Amino acid sequence: GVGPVADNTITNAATSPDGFSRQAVVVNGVTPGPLVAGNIGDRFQLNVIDNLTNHTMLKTTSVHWHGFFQQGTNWADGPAFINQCPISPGHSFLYDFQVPNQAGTFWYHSHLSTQYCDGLRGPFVVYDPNDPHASRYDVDNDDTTITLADWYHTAAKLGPAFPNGADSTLINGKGRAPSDSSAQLSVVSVTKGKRYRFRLVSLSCDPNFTFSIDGHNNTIIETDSVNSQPLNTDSIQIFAAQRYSFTLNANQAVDNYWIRANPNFGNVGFNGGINSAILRYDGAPAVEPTTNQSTSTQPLNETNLHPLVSTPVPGSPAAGGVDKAINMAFNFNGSNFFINGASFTPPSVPVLLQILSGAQTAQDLLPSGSVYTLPSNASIEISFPATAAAPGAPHPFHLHGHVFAVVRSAGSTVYNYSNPIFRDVVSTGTPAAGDNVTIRFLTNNPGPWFLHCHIDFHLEGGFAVVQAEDVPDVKATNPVPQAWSDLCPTYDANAPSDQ
Protein backbone atom coordinates (compact mmCIF):
# COMPACT_ATOMS: atom_id res chain seq x y z
CA GLY A 1 0.00 0.00 0.00
CA VAL A 2 2.38 2.69 1.26
CA GLY A 3 6.18 2.71 0.87
CA PRO A 4 8.98 1.88 0.29
CA VAL A 5 9.34 5.66 0.83
CA ALA A 6 6.51 7.09 2.96
CA ASP A 7 5.47 9.07 6.02
CA ASN A 8 4.01 7.02 8.87
CA THR A 9 2.10 9.46 11.09
CA ILE A 10 1.42 8.21 14.62
CA THR A 11 -1.51 9.72 16.56
CA ASN A 12 -4.06 8.91 19.27
CA ALA A 13 -7.59 8.47 17.92
CA ALA A 14 -11.00 7.04 18.75
CA THR A 15 -11.65 3.71 17.00
CA SER A 16 -14.41 1.10 17.23
CA PRO A 17 -13.24 -2.10 15.45
CA ASP A 18 -15.91 -4.09 17.32
CA GLY A 19 -18.43 -1.26 17.81
CA PHE A 20 -16.90 -0.30 21.16
CA SER A 21 -15.31 3.14 20.93
CA ARG A 22 -11.96 3.63 22.66
CA GLN A 23 -8.79 5.71 22.31
CA ALA A 24 -6.01 3.86 20.49
CA VAL A 25 -2.62 4.45 18.87
CA VAL A 26 -3.15 4.62 15.09
CA VAL A 27 -0.97 4.82 11.95
CA ASN A 28 -2.11 7.19 9.22
CA GLY A 29 -5.46 7.39 11.04
CA VAL A 30 -6.11 3.64 11.25
CA THR A 31 -5.52 0.55 13.39
CA PRO A 32 -4.24 -1.87 12.28
CA GLY A 33 -1.93 0.43 10.32
CA PRO A 34 -1.78 0.55 6.51
CA LEU A 35 0.04 -2.10 4.49
CA VAL A 36 3.66 -1.12 3.93
CA ALA A 37 5.05 -2.74 0.78
CA GLY A 38 8.01 -2.94 -1.57
CA ASN A 39 10.13 -5.35 -3.61
CA ILE A 40 13.28 -7.34 -2.83
CA GLY A 41 16.32 -5.06 -3.27
CA ASP A 42 14.37 -1.92 -2.29
CA ARG A 43 15.60 0.85 -0.05
CA PHE A 44 12.93 1.63 2.52
CA GLN A 45 12.73 5.18 3.84
CA LEU A 46 9.94 5.20 6.38
CA ASN A 47 9.58 8.56 8.09
CA VAL A 48 7.84 7.97 11.40
CA ILE A 49 6.11 11.16 12.54
CA ASP A 50 5.32 11.08 16.25
CA ASN A 51 2.21 13.18 16.87
CA LEU A 52 1.07 11.30 19.99
CA THR A 53 -0.51 13.30 22.83
CA ASN A 54 -1.58 10.61 25.32
CA HIS A 55 0.89 9.67 28.07
CA THR A 56 -1.17 6.63 29.19
CA MET A 57 -0.53 5.00 25.79
CA LEU A 58 2.92 6.67 25.69
CA LYS A 59 3.68 9.87 23.77
CA THR A 60 7.04 8.48 22.68
CA THR A 61 7.32 5.63 20.18
CA SER A 62 9.71 3.28 18.38
CA VAL A 63 8.92 1.04 15.41
CA HIS A 64 10.25 -2.46 14.76
CA TRP A 65 10.20 -3.92 11.25
CA HIS A 66 9.58 -7.57 12.11
CA GLY A 67 11.62 -10.21 10.29
CA PHE A 68 14.20 -8.02 8.55
CA PHE A 69 17.92 -8.76 9.03
CA GLN A 70 18.85 -5.03 9.16
CA GLN A 71 22.45 -5.83 8.17
CA GLY A 72 24.49 -2.64 8.56
CA THR A 73 21.45 -0.85 9.95
CA ASN A 74 21.15 -2.22 13.45
CA TRP A 75 20.17 1.31 14.57
CA ALA A 76 16.81 1.12 12.79
CA ASP A 77 15.69 -2.28 14.12
CA GLY A 78 13.32 -0.63 16.61
CA PRO A 79 13.51 -2.13 20.14
CA ALA A 80 13.61 0.73 22.65
CA PHE A 81 16.83 0.91 24.70
CA ILE A 82 18.36 -1.89 22.63
CA ASN A 83 18.74 -0.30 19.19
CA GLN A 84 17.53 3.28 19.87
CA CYS A 85 15.98 5.68 22.34
CA PRO A 86 12.30 6.24 21.50
CA ILE A 87 11.17 8.97 19.10
CA SER A 88 9.82 11.93 21.12
CA PRO A 89 6.40 13.57 20.62
CA GLY A 90 6.48 16.43 18.09
CA HIS A 91 9.49 14.85 16.37
CA SER A 92 9.97 12.62 13.35
CA PHE A 93 12.56 9.91 12.72
CA LEU A 94 13.61 8.33 9.42
CA TYR A 95 14.08 4.57 9.37
CA ASP A 96 16.35 4.06 6.36
CA PHE A 97 17.20 0.48 5.43
CA GLN A 98 17.52 -2.02 2.60
CA VAL A 99 16.01 -5.47 2.04
CA PRO A 100 18.54 -6.91 -0.48
CA ASN A 101 18.24 -10.61 0.35
CA GLN A 102 14.70 -11.15 1.67
CA ALA A 103 11.18 -11.37 0.30
CA GLY A 104 7.89 -12.42 1.88
CA THR A 105 5.41 -11.52 4.61
CA PHE A 106 6.43 -9.32 7.55
CA TRP A 107 4.86 -6.75 9.86
CA TYR A 108 5.70 -3.59 11.78
CA HIS A 109 4.86 -2.65 15.36
CA SER A 110 5.78 -0.38 18.23
CA HIS A 111 8.67 -1.91 20.13
CA LEU A 112 8.27 0.38 23.12
CA SER A 113 6.65 -1.16 26.21
CA THR A 114 3.17 -2.58 25.46
CA GLN A 115 2.30 0.21 22.99
CA TYR A 116 1.65 -2.11 20.03
CA CYS A 117 -1.24 -3.74 21.93
CA ASP A 118 -2.81 -0.26 22.01
CA GLY A 119 -2.89 -0.24 18.19
CA LEU A 120 0.51 0.51 16.64
CA ARG A 121 0.84 -2.55 14.39
CA GLY A 122 0.37 -3.27 10.69
CA PRO A 123 1.34 -5.68 7.90
CA PHE A 124 4.51 -5.34 5.79
CA VAL A 125 5.00 -7.19 2.48
CA VAL A 126 8.12 -7.50 0.31
CA TYR A 127 7.23 -8.89 -3.11
CA ASP A 128 9.43 -11.09 -5.28
CA PRO A 129 9.19 -10.45 -9.06
CA ASN A 130 10.71 -13.92 -9.54
CA ASP A 131 8.77 -15.58 -6.71
CA PRO A 132 9.35 -19.37 -7.00
CA HIS A 133 5.72 -19.93 -5.93
CA ALA A 134 4.22 -17.61 -8.59
CA SER A 135 2.78 -20.49 -10.67
CA ARG A 136 0.68 -21.66 -7.69
CA TYR A 137 -1.58 -18.57 -7.65
CA ASP A 138 -3.22 -15.83 -9.72
CA VAL A 139 -3.82 -12.98 -7.27
CA ASP A 140 -1.47 -11.40 -4.72
CA ASN A 141 -2.21 -7.81 -3.65
CA ASP A 142 -3.45 -5.47 -0.89
CA ASP A 143 -6.71 -7.43 -0.64
CA THR A 144 -4.99 -10.80 -0.03
CA THR A 145 -3.36 -9.68 3.22
CA ILE A 146 -5.24 -11.09 6.23
CA THR A 147 -4.29 -9.64 9.61
CA LEU A 148 -5.20 -11.18 12.97
CA ALA A 149 -5.24 -9.19 16.23
CA ASP A 150 -6.35 -9.37 19.84
CA TRP A 151 -8.43 -6.33 20.83
CA TYR A 152 -9.01 -5.01 24.36
CA HIS A 153 -11.59 -2.51 25.63
CA THR A 154 -9.20 -1.43 28.39
CA ALA A 155 -5.80 0.03 27.45
CA ALA A 156 -2.57 -1.92 28.03
CA LYS A 157 -1.48 0.18 31.03
CA LEU A 158 -4.99 0.34 32.53
CA GLY A 159 -6.06 -3.32 32.76
CA PRO A 160 -4.48 -6.40 34.39
CA ALA A 161 -0.72 -6.92 33.99
CA PHE A 162 -1.56 -10.19 32.22
CA PRO A 163 -5.10 -10.02 30.71
CA ASN A 164 -7.11 -13.26 30.44
CA GLY A 165 -7.76 -12.91 26.70
CA ALA A 166 -9.01 -10.21 24.37
CA ASP A 167 -12.52 -8.74 24.25
CA SER A 168 -12.55 -9.56 20.55
CA THR A 169 -10.41 -11.08 17.83
CA LEU A 170 -10.07 -8.77 14.84
CA ILE A 171 -9.69 -10.12 11.32
CA ASN A 172 -8.64 -7.33 8.94
CA GLY A 173 -9.40 -4.80 11.69
CA LYS A 174 -12.97 -5.89 12.47
CA GLY A 175 -14.52 -8.44 14.82
CA ARG A 176 -17.26 -8.98 17.38
CA ALA A 177 -17.30 -8.68 21.16
CA PRO A 178 -20.18 -9.87 23.43
CA SER A 179 -21.17 -6.18 23.82
CA ASP A 180 -22.34 -5.95 20.17
CA SER A 181 -23.18 -9.06 18.12
CA SER A 182 -24.31 -7.04 15.08
CA ALA A 183 -21.01 -5.18 14.65
CA GLN A 184 -19.65 -5.04 11.09
CA LEU A 185 -17.61 -8.08 10.08
CA SER A 186 -14.66 -7.94 7.68
CA VAL A 187 -15.35 -9.27 4.20
CA VAL A 188 -12.65 -10.86 2.05
CA SER A 189 -13.76 -10.91 -1.60
CA VAL A 190 -12.85 -13.70 -4.03
CA THR A 191 -13.76 -14.27 -7.68
CA LYS A 192 -14.60 -17.93 -8.35
CA GLY A 193 -12.02 -19.73 -10.49
CA LYS A 194 -8.97 -17.79 -9.28
CA ARG A 195 -6.23 -18.86 -6.85
CA TYR A 196 -5.27 -16.37 -4.15
CA ARG A 197 -2.05 -16.00 -2.22
CA PHE A 198 -3.37 -15.03 1.21
CA ARG A 199 -0.72 -13.59 3.49
CA LEU A 200 -1.80 -14.34 7.06
CA VAL A 201 -0.18 -12.04 9.62
CA SER A 202 -0.57 -12.37 13.39
CA LEU A 203 -0.43 -8.89 14.94
CA SER A 204 -1.46 -10.46 18.24
CA CYS A 205 -0.10 -9.23 21.57
CA ASP A 206 -0.89 -12.38 23.56
CA PRO A 207 -3.10 -15.22 22.33
CA ASN A 208 -2.51 -17.54 19.39
CA PHE A 209 -5.27 -18.30 16.88
CA THR A 210 -6.48 -21.44 15.16
CA PHE A 211 -7.30 -20.23 11.66
CA SER A 212 -9.63 -21.97 9.20
CA ILE A 213 -12.02 -21.24 6.33
CA ASP A 214 -15.26 -23.24 5.98
CA GLY A 215 -15.32 -25.59 2.98
CA HIS A 216 -11.82 -24.63 1.83
CA ASN A 217 -8.36 -26.14 2.23
CA ASN A 218 -5.13 -24.14 2.34
CA THR A 219 -1.74 -24.69 0.72
CA ILE A 220 1.03 -23.23 2.89
CA ILE A 221 3.85 -21.87 0.70
CA GLU A 222 5.56 -19.47 3.14
CA THR A 223 6.53 -19.61 6.85
CA ASP A 224 7.53 -16.28 8.48
CA SER A 225 9.23 -14.98 5.30
CA VAL A 226 10.74 -18.36 4.38
CA ASN A 227 9.53 -20.16 1.23
CA SER A 228 8.30 -23.63 2.10
CA GLN A 229 7.42 -26.67 0.03
CA PRO A 230 3.62 -26.68 -0.60
CA LEU A 231 1.80 -28.12 2.43
CA ASN A 232 -1.94 -28.73 2.29
CA THR A 233 -3.73 -28.08 5.58
CA ASP A 234 -7.31 -27.41 6.70
CA SER A 235 -6.34 -25.38 9.78
CA ILE A 236 -3.39 -23.27 10.94
CA GLN A 237 -2.56 -22.53 14.56
CA ILE A 238 -0.68 -19.24 14.27
CA PHE A 239 1.21 -17.80 17.23
CA ALA A 240 1.75 -14.12 17.98
CA ALA A 241 4.06 -12.44 15.41
CA GLN A 242 4.13 -15.43 13.03
CA ARG A 243 3.18 -15.24 9.35
CA TYR A 244 1.97 -17.73 6.75
CA SER A 245 1.22 -17.48 3.07
CA PHE A 246 -1.40 -19.97 1.94
CA THR A 247 -2.97 -20.51 -1.45
CA LEU A 248 -6.74 -20.69 -1.50
CA ASN A 249 -8.44 -21.86 -4.68
CA ALA A 250 -11.84 -20.18 -4.98
CA ASN A 251 -13.30 -23.38 -6.47
CA GLN A 252 -16.43 -23.82 -4.34
CA ALA A 253 -19.96 -22.62 -5.11
CA VAL A 254 -20.56 -18.86 -5.19
CA ASP A 255 -21.46 -18.35 -1.51
CA ASN A 256 -20.57 -16.86 1.88
CA TYR A 257 -18.14 -18.89 4.00
CA TRP A 258 -17.07 -18.34 7.61
CA ILE A 259 -13.44 -17.33 8.10
CA ARG A 260 -12.50 -18.50 11.61
CA ALA A 261 -9.73 -17.43 14.02
CA ASN A 262 -10.27 -19.14 17.37
CA PRO A 263 -8.07 -17.81 20.22
CA ASN A 264 -6.51 -20.22 22.75
CA PHE A 265 -8.07 -18.33 25.68
CA GLY A 266 -10.62 -15.56 26.29
CA ASN A 267 -13.86 -15.57 24.32
CA VAL A 268 -13.51 -18.89 22.49
CA GLY A 269 -15.84 -20.34 19.83
CA PHE A 270 -18.15 -18.50 17.45
CA ASN A 271 -21.35 -17.55 19.32
CA GLY A 272 -22.83 -14.48 17.63
CA GLY A 273 -20.14 -14.45 14.93
CA ILE A 274 -17.24 -13.65 17.28
CA ASN A 275 -13.72 -14.68 16.15
CA SER A 276 -15.07 -14.55 12.59
CA ALA A 277 -14.90 -12.91 9.17
CA ILE A 278 -16.62 -13.51 5.83
CA LEU A 279 -15.26 -15.08 2.66
CA ARG A 280 -17.61 -13.69 0.00
CA TYR A 281 -17.52 -14.98 -3.57
CA ASP A 282 -18.29 -12.31 -6.21
CA GLY A 283 -22.05 -12.48 -6.79
CA ALA A 284 -23.00 -13.88 -3.38
CA PRO A 285 -25.57 -11.81 -1.42
CA ALA A 286 -24.39 -9.32 1.23
CA VAL A 287 -25.31 -11.59 4.15
CA GLU A 288 -23.59 -13.62 6.87
CA PRO A 289 -22.45 -17.17 6.10
CA THR A 290 -24.48 -20.09 7.44
CA THR A 291 -21.71 -22.60 6.71
CA ASN A 292 -20.72 -25.09 9.41
CA GLN A 293 -17.23 -25.77 10.74
CA SER A 294 -15.85 -29.23 10.01
CA THR A 295 -13.30 -31.06 12.16
CA SER A 296 -9.72 -30.32 11.13
CA THR A 297 -8.33 -33.55 9.66
CA GLN A 298 -5.17 -31.94 8.26
CA PRO A 299 -4.00 -29.45 10.89
CA LEU A 300 -0.67 -27.72 10.41
CA ASN A 301 2.23 -29.37 12.19
CA GLU A 302 5.49 -27.39 12.18
CA THR A 303 7.53 -30.60 11.72
CA ASN A 304 5.74 -31.07 8.36
CA LEU A 305 7.12 -27.74 7.09
CA HIS A 306 10.30 -27.84 5.01
CA PRO A 307 12.12 -25.10 3.04
CA LEU A 308 11.33 -24.90 -0.70
CA VAL A 309 15.06 -24.85 -1.51
CA SER A 310 17.78 -26.90 0.19
CA THR A 311 18.82 -24.88 3.24
CA PRO A 312 21.69 -26.25 5.38
CA VAL A 313 21.29 -26.30 9.16
CA PRO A 314 24.08 -24.41 11.00
CA GLY A 315 26.66 -26.72 12.63
CA SER A 316 26.89 -30.52 12.66
CA PRO A 317 24.10 -33.13 13.11
CA ALA A 318 24.52 -33.66 16.87
CA ALA A 319 23.16 -32.23 20.13
CA GLY A 320 25.40 -29.23 20.83
CA GLY A 321 27.26 -29.76 17.53
CA VAL A 322 27.77 -26.00 17.19
CA ASP A 323 30.34 -23.32 18.04
CA LYS A 324 28.24 -22.08 20.98
CA ALA A 325 25.29 -23.66 22.81
CA ILE A 326 23.02 -21.62 25.09
CA ASN A 327 20.24 -22.89 27.36
CA MET A 328 17.49 -20.54 28.53
CA ALA A 329 16.18 -21.39 32.01
CA PHE A 330 12.85 -19.69 32.70
CA ASN A 331 11.49 -18.31 35.99
CA PHE A 332 8.42 -16.24 36.98
CA ASN A 333 7.60 -14.63 40.33
CA GLY A 334 4.05 -13.34 39.84
CA SER A 335 4.96 -10.06 38.12
CA ASN A 336 8.31 -10.58 36.37
CA PHE A 337 9.79 -13.17 34.03
CA PHE A 338 13.44 -14.27 34.30
CA ILE A 339 15.85 -15.88 31.84
CA ASN A 340 18.84 -17.55 33.50
CA GLY A 341 18.24 -15.61 36.73
CA ALA A 342 17.79 -12.19 35.10
CA SER A 343 14.59 -10.23 34.46
CA PHE A 344 15.21 -7.72 31.67
CA THR A 345 15.15 -4.05 32.66
CA PRO A 346 15.78 -1.59 29.80
CA PRO A 347 19.11 0.24 30.25
CA SER A 348 19.36 4.05 30.36
CA VAL A 349 21.82 4.00 27.45
CA PRO A 350 20.60 1.85 24.53
CA VAL A 351 22.70 -1.31 24.16
CA LEU A 352 23.78 -0.23 20.65
CA LEU A 353 24.86 3.19 21.96
CA GLN A 354 26.78 1.43 24.76
CA ILE A 355 28.62 -0.61 22.10
CA LEU A 356 29.31 2.53 20.03
CA SER A 357 30.66 4.06 23.26
CA GLY A 358 33.14 1.17 23.67
CA ALA A 359 31.28 -1.56 25.58
CA GLN A 360 32.09 -4.84 23.81
CA THR A 361 32.08 -7.49 26.56
CA ALA A 362 29.15 -8.94 28.53
CA GLN A 363 30.89 -7.59 31.65
CA ASP A 364 30.82 -3.99 30.38
CA LEU A 365 27.38 -4.14 28.72
CA LEU A 366 24.15 -3.24 30.56
CA PRO A 367 21.87 -4.60 31.90
CA SER A 368 24.22 -7.03 33.68
CA GLY A 369 23.34 -10.70 33.13
CA SER A 370 20.95 -10.04 30.23
CA VAL A 371 23.49 -9.52 27.43
CA TYR A 372 25.10 -12.50 25.69
CA THR A 373 28.19 -11.85 23.58
CA LEU A 374 28.35 -14.11 20.52
CA PRO A 375 31.40 -15.00 18.39
CA SER A 376 31.42 -13.83 14.77
CA ASN A 377 30.80 -16.26 11.87
CA ALA A 378 29.74 -19.03 14.24
CA SER A 379 26.95 -21.58 14.54
CA ILE A 380 24.72 -21.03 17.57
CA GLU A 381 22.24 -23.39 19.23
CA ILE A 382 19.62 -22.12 21.70
CA SER A 383 17.22 -24.35 23.65
CA PHE A 384 14.10 -23.10 25.44
CA PRO A 385 13.05 -25.97 27.72
CA ALA A 386 9.38 -25.55 28.64
CA THR A 387 8.81 -25.30 32.39
CA ALA A 388 5.85 -24.77 34.74
CA ALA A 389 8.10 -22.21 36.48
CA ALA A 390 7.11 -19.84 33.67
CA PRO A 391 3.31 -19.86 33.12
CA GLY A 392 1.72 -18.45 29.95
CA ALA A 393 2.64 -21.38 27.68
CA PRO A 394 3.01 -21.82 24.82
CA HIS A 395 5.50 -18.93 24.70
CA PRO A 396 6.38 -17.77 21.16
CA PHE A 397 10.04 -16.69 21.16
CA HIS A 398 11.41 -14.29 18.60
CA LEU A 399 14.99 -13.62 17.52
CA HIS A 400 15.80 -10.28 15.86
CA GLY A 401 18.20 -9.88 12.92
CA HIS A 402 18.05 -13.58 12.03
CA VAL A 403 16.14 -16.49 10.62
CA PHE A 404 16.75 -19.74 12.49
CA ALA A 405 16.31 -23.46 11.85
CA VAL A 406 13.76 -25.11 14.14
CA VAL A 407 15.72 -28.31 14.82
CA ARG A 408 13.19 -29.40 17.45
CA SER A 409 9.58 -28.16 17.31
CA ALA A 410 6.94 -28.13 20.05
CA GLY A 411 5.08 -31.43 20.53
CA SER A 412 8.01 -33.27 18.98
CA THR A 413 10.99 -35.23 20.32
CA VAL A 414 12.70 -35.32 16.91
CA TYR A 415 15.83 -33.33 16.17
CA ASN A 416 15.89 -32.47 12.46
CA TYR A 417 19.41 -31.53 11.35
CA SER A 418 18.65 -32.18 7.67
CA ASN A 419 15.69 -30.17 6.35
CA PRO A 420 13.85 -28.38 9.16
CA ILE A 421 11.87 -25.21 8.50
CA PHE A 422 13.59 -21.85 9.05
CA ARG A 423 11.60 -19.00 10.66
CA ASP A 424 11.80 -16.07 13.13
CA VAL A 425 9.04 -16.75 15.70
CA VAL A 426 8.69 -20.18 17.30
CA SER A 427 6.34 -21.68 19.87
CA THR A 428 8.35 -23.14 22.75
CA GLY A 429 5.46 -25.49 23.58
CA THR A 430 4.33 -26.82 26.95
CA PRO A 431 5.97 -28.38 30.06
CA ALA A 432 3.21 -31.05 29.90
CA ALA A 433 4.79 -32.52 26.75
CA GLY A 434 8.29 -32.00 28.18
CA ASP A 435 9.08 -29.72 25.24
CA ASN A 436 12.62 -28.56 24.62
CA VAL A 437 12.28 -26.37 21.54
CA THR A 438 15.71 -25.79 20.06
CA ILE A 439 16.88 -23.35 17.38
CA ARG A 440 20.05 -22.85 15.30
CA PHE A 441 21.47 -19.82 13.49
CA LEU A 442 24.72 -18.41 12.11
CA THR A 443 26.30 -15.20 13.42
CA ASN A 444 26.48 -13.32 10.12
CA ASN A 445 25.05 -10.01 11.35
CA PRO A 446 27.05 -7.71 13.70
CA GLY A 447 24.92 -5.85 16.27
CA PRO A 448 22.82 -6.28 19.42
CA TRP A 449 19.70 -8.33 18.67
CA PHE A 450 16.68 -8.78 20.93
CA LEU A 451 15.60 -12.31 21.86
CA HIS A 452 12.30 -12.42 23.73
CA CYS A 453 8.84 -13.89 24.18
CA HIS A 454 6.57 -12.04 21.73
CA ILE A 455 3.62 -12.03 24.14
CA ASP A 456 4.01 -8.32 24.80
CA PHE A 457 2.75 -8.44 28.40
CA HIS A 458 5.48 -11.04 29.09
CA LEU A 459 8.16 -8.96 27.30
CA GLU A 460 7.04 -6.09 29.57
CA GLY A 461 7.67 -8.35 32.60
CA GLY A 462 11.27 -8.81 31.42
CA PHE A 463 11.06 -12.04 29.39
CA ALA A 464 13.99 -10.95 27.22
CA VAL A 465 17.76 -11.14 26.66
CA VAL A 466 20.16 -9.45 24.22
CA GLN A 467 22.35 -11.35 21.78
CA ALA A 468 25.32 -9.03 21.21
CA GLU A 469 26.84 -10.23 17.95
CA ASP A 470 30.37 -9.47 16.69
CA VAL A 471 30.78 -6.52 19.07
CA PRO A 472 34.21 -5.28 17.85
CA ASP A 473 32.78 -4.83 14.31
CA VAL A 474 29.39 -3.30 15.25
CA LYS A 475 30.45 0.38 14.96
CA ALA A 476 32.16 -0.01 11.55
CA THR A 477 29.35 -2.21 10.16
CA ASN A 478 26.46 -0.02 11.39
CA PRO A 479 27.24 3.66 10.74
CA VAL A 480 24.53 5.74 12.42
CA PRO A 481 22.75 8.83 11.04
CA GLN A 482 22.80 12.15 12.94
CA ALA A 483 19.05 11.79 13.57
CA TRP A 484 19.70 8.54 15.46
CA SER A 485 22.48 10.15 17.52
CA ASP A 486 19.96 12.88 18.40
CA LEU A 487 17.24 10.52 19.68
CA CYS A 488 18.62 9.89 23.18
CA PRO A 489 19.41 13.51 24.14
CA THR A 490 15.91 14.53 22.95
CA TYR A 491 14.19 11.67 24.82
CA ASP A 492 16.21 12.19 28.01
CA ALA A 493 15.31 15.91 27.84
CA ASN A 494 11.57 15.08 27.97
CA ALA A 495 9.46 15.76 31.02
CA PRO A 496 8.54 12.23 32.23
CA SER A 497 4.86 13.09 31.58
CA ASP A 498 5.69 13.58 27.87
CA GLN A 499 7.19 10.09 27.60
Ligand X SMILES: *[C@@H]1O[C@H](CO)[C@@H](O[C@@H]2O[C@H](CO)[C@@H](O[C@@H]3O[C@H](CO[C@H]4O[C@H](CO)[C@@H](O)[C@H](O[C@H]5O[C@H](CO)[C@@H](O)[C@H](O)[C@@H]5O)[C@@H]4O)[C@@H](O)[C@H](O)[C@@H]3O)[C@H](O)[C@H]2NC(C)=O)[C@H](O)[C@H]1NC(C)=O
Ligand Y SMILES: *[C@@H]1O[C@H](CO)[C@@H](O[C@@H]2O[C@H](CO)[C@@H](O[C@@H]3O[C@H](CO)[C@@H](O)[C@H](O)[C@@H]3O)[C@H](O)[C@H]2NC(C)=O)[C@H](O)[C@H]1NC(C)=O
Q: Which residues are catalytic?
A: 64, 66, 109, 111, 395, 398, 400, 452-455, 458, 463
297 binds, among ligand Y, ligand X, ligand NAG, none (CB under 5 to 8 A by kind): ligand Y
Stretch in the footprint of ligand NAG (CB under 6 A) among 8-16, 38-46, 128-136, 327-335: 327-335
Cα-based distances in Å from 366 to 284, 354, 454, 467: 59, 8, 22, 12
Tell me the per-residue interface mask from 297 to 326 with ligand NAG, x by CB under 6 A, - otherwise. ----------------------xx------
Least separation in angstroms between residue 17's CB and ligand X is: 12
Report residue 374 CA to chain centroid gap.
24
Helices (H), 268-405: 351-356
Contacts of 13 (CB under 8 A, 6+ apart): 23, 24, 26, 29
Strand (E) or helix (H) holding 63: strand 63-66
Member of 85, 221, 359, 453 binding Cu ion (CB under 5 A): 453
20 binds, among ligand Y, Cu ion, ligand X, none (CB under 5 to 8 A by kind): ligand X
Q: Which is nearer to ligand X, 117 or 240 (CB)?
A: 117
Least separation in angstroms between residue 154's CB and ligand X is: 4
Cβ pair 468, 374 in contact under 8 A:
yes
Which of 117, 287, 274, 278 lies closest to 180, judged by CA? 274
Dmax (CA) for the chain in angstroms is 66
Please give the residue ranges that form the binding site for ligand Y (CB under 6 A): 215, 217, 234, 297-298
**For 341, which DSSP code?**
T
Member of 186, 229, 293, 327 binding ligand NAG (CB under 6 A): 327
Least separation in angstroms between residue 333's CB and ligand NAG is: 4
Q: Which is nearer to ligand X, 25 or 221 (CB)?
A: 25
**CA–CA separation, 213 vs 279, rounded Å?**
8
Stretch in the footprint of Cu ion (CB under 5 A) among 148-156, 250-258, 281-289, 387-395: 387-395
Residue 334 binding ligand NAG, by CB under 6 A: yes
Q: Which is nearer to ligand X, 50 or 381 (CB)?
A: 50
Contacts of 130 (CB under 8 A, 6+ apart): none
Stretch in the footprint of Cu ion (CB under 5 A) among 58-66, 258-266, 365-373, 430-438: 58-66
Q: Which is nearer to ligand Y, 7 or 234 (CB)?
A: 234
Which of 77, 21, 87 lies closest to 49, judged by CA? 87
**CA–CA separation, 445 vs 478, rounded Å?**
10
Residue nearest to ligand Y (CB): 217
Cβ pair 127, 40 in contact under 8 A:
yes
**CA–CA separation, 289 vs 276, rounded Å?**
10
Binding residues (CB under 6 A) for ligand NAG: these are 319-320, 327, 333-336, 343, 383, 385, 436
Binding residues (CB under 5 A) for Cu ion: these are 66, 241, 392, 395, 400, 450, 453, 455, 458
